[PDB]
Each structure stands twice: as C-alpha cells, then as structure tokens.
C-alpha cells in the first residue's frame, strides 16, 4: 500500500534507484483523517505494537487553554478562520494542528467573573460577583492587585467569540485541544484576517 520509504525517490545525483525488494508493512502510511467541524465521530486505528490511534473524522468541542491565566475549559468550536497551508482547508472547515479557530468565549468569561470578581459583560446561568463571602472578596482583591488583562482578549470575550490555535493533532489523538491567541501572535493573525475583509 502507501509507503514512506526513500526507495522510490531519486538519488541526489538524479539517478533511479533499482528496487530489489517488495514493500514492507513496517514502512506503511495511512490515508489522512481530514477531520472536519461537526458532531463527534472517530475511528480507531490499530497501530504497530497493538496500540490504538484515534482518527477523528468530525470534532465539535475541545479543551482550550488560557496560557496567561494557566487555565483551560471545554468549549464549543464555532468556526475555522485561518490555515497557513491553504485557504481551501479553511473553506472546508478542516481541523489540523496550528490552524486558527474561533471558540465560544462564555466559559472563559464566566471563570474570570468567578476568579477575579470582574464581569466583562458590563453594559450588557450567569455568575454574579455580588453574592460572595467577604473572604472571597479579599481573595479577589489579592488576585486583582498583580493582574492586568489585555484589551484584545477582553474585547473578544465581550463579543462571545475568541480566536485560538489548535495544539493537538486530531488525526492522531482524536482531540481538538488548543490555546487562546495572545499578544503578538494574536496581532499577527488579526492582521491576516483583516486582509480582504
């Protein structure tokens, strides 16, 4: 079947390699997952040694981490907005490592309110900072003293969608985990998205 060997390749001299053996199972490749955005569907793959890879065909949710807050939440995948390989992967809503996605910002907004006592949804189920023990208020002040959130993420939370980068490999593990874009990386990709509306 599909092979990964260098036998079919040309030599650096440009000569043709004369193959004198049949293909081996130890050098095989598999067809790509081509994971798309949709309701969860996975297919186990028995790999060498009896271990199983999880070939995800469709994924809709994953663990997305806020690095500066050192937290993570299970959130819904809303859209795929940018892919550095080609825009056809964006058009087909393919999920691969390092692609840029938009995920639901509600769990991150709610955690901020619970952990810092700051409700980002000012000026308009939902945690209320008023119902807090006086000890929790003091811990809120202690956490809030050495803390500065960036406006770019803060604005994205307000709109309900926040951009993130996939950090896992859905074709190998069957997961769509990621990390929220921050700082210069967010500004880079915001400029890429700003190009052509």
């Amino acid at each position: 079947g599909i092979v990964r060997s260098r036998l079919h390749k040309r030599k650096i001299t440009g000569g043709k390699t004369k193959i004198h053996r049949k293909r081996m199972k130890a050098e095989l490749g598999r067809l790509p997952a081509n994971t798309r955005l949709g309701a969860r569907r996975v297919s186990p793959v028995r790999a060498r040694g009896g271990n199983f890879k999880i070939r995800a065909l469709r994924l809709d949710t994953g663990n997305f981490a806020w690095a500066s807050e050192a937290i993570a939440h299970r959130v819904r995948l809303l859209d795929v907005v940018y892919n550095a390989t080609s825009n056809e992967l964006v058009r087909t809503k393919t999920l691969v490592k390092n692609c840029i996605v938009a995920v639901d910002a509600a769990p991150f907004k709610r955690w901020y309110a619970k952990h810092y006592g700051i409700d980002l949804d000012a000026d308009k189920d939902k945690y209320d900072v008023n119902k807090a023990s006086p000890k929790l208020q003091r811990e809120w002040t202690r956490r809030r003293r050495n803390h500065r959130v960036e406006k770019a993420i803060a604005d994205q939370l307000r709109e309900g969608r926040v951009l993130a980068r996939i950090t896992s490999r859905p074709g190998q593990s069957g997961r769509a985990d990621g990390i929220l874009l921050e700082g210069a990386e967010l500004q880079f990709y915001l400029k890429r998205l700003e190009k052509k509306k």
Partner: protein, 153 residues
C-alpha cells in the same frame, strides 16, 4: 488594568504562519526568569554538551529556527566532523567538503578523495565559502541533511 503586550516584529514574521519557539511561551505576562535574555525578552536556549559554547547570537538573538541545535529540540549525538564550506546558496543549509587522502595498498601511494555533506546552518553563525566549520550529527532534518553546524572557525 490593561497589559502591554509585545509588538509583532516584521523583520522575523514573514512566513504566512507565526514563527515562534515551541519550548517557551513568549506571551507570558510574568517571565519565569529561566529563559530571559539580557534584553528582557523570553527566548529558549539550551547548552549542548561536548564543550561547545552557545553563541551569543543564539542567546540574545531574535531569529526563529526549529532546526537550530541551540534554540530548538534538535540534539547532537554521534559523530563530530570538521569540513570546509563549499556552498551557501541554500536557505539555512550549507554544503561542506571533507578532503582526505585514500591509500592504495598495491601502489603504496595515496590519492586525493572528497565527500560532500549537506549541513543545517543556524542563523547564529553566518559562514562563508572556504570557511572551516565543526558539525555535529543530529537526527534526519531533510532528505540529505544529517548534521548541524556547531562552530565556525
């Protein structure tokens, strides 16, 4: 209130995908003090063994190279070789020559032979044609590349 994030450096980011180090987070609001250089920026660097000094460009530079042995996960193990730079026309890759004399027993005499090796060159070196370099064996980095430049003499 609000956090002052670092700005995009256009001199480095021209690859259609954001260039970054995988070992560290450059956006960390509180630097860990472990991987901070003299300029205050966060930059991953490691010491390779065998008594090789990590170049200052690696320590306090701005380049992003996932194949550099001083700022990435590429490790040096196996053979350590010396050679002469033969060509620098590729991006981050150089061709070196190893000239040597081969002995022929029947005639009790030598002949001049040479071998060519494709070697990855980190942006921290900048060697020229005719320069002498020290190269360390690493994992396969391309179809032909098996060595990384360690020192330019």
């Amino acid at each position: 209130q609000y956090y002052h994030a670092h700005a995009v450096d256009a001199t480095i980011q021209h690859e259609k995908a954001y260039q970054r180090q995988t070992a560290v987070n450059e956006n960390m609001h509180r630097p860990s003090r472990k991987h901070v250089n003299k300029s205050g920026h966060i930059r991953y660097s490691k010491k390779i063994g065998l008594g090789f000094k990590t170049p200052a460009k690696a320590l306090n530079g701005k380049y992003i190279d996932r194949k550099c042995p001083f700022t990435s996960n590429v490790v040096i193990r196996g053979r350590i070789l010396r050679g002469v730079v033969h060509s620098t026309k590729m991006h981050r890759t150089i061709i070196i020559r190893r000239n040597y004399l081969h002995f022929i027993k029947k005639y009790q005499r030598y002949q001049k032979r040479h071998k060519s090796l494709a070697v990855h060159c980190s942006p921290a070196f900048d060697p020229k044609q005719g320069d002498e370099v020290v190269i360390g064996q690493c994992r396969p980095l391309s179809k032909t590349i098996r060595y990384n430049v360690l020192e330019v003499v």
